């Protein structure tokens, strides 16, 4: 119980710190050929035009 309690110590503050560094648009997946989900940021239209 001491070992598993130490793993969970500051769990919320660890996840929030990692989440703060993420780019939300990189999570947004789109399917071109029905099977392959690519991040919308990897689409050439978005690489070239997205601010």
């Amino acid at each position: 119980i001491i070992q598993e309690s130490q793993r969970l110590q500051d769990s919320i503050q660890k996840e929030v710190k990692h989440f703060s560094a993420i780019c939300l648009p990189a999570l947004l997946k789109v399917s071109t050929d029905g099977f392959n989900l690519l991040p919308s940021r990897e689409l050439s239209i978005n690489r070239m035009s997205n601010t």
Binding site: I12, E15, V16, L24, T51
Partner: protein, 51 residues
């Protein structure tokens, strides 16, 4: 035509500030959902501690 091109550059600069305000709103919604889910887990641990 120089005056027009200067004011066009100022309009494009404003569209960039609106997207930052929206990213903050999305992050704040996700972190509210996360806080609610962590309150439910904390309430479960509080019941285990009472036992």
């Amino acid at each position: 035509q120089e005056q027009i091109q200067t004011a066009e550059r100022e309009i494009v600069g404003q569209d960039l500030n609106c997207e930052r305000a929206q990213d903050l709103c999305r992050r704040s919604l996700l972190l509210r959902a996360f806080n609610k889910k962590r309150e439910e887990e904390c309430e479960a641990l509080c019941q285990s501690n009472k036992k």
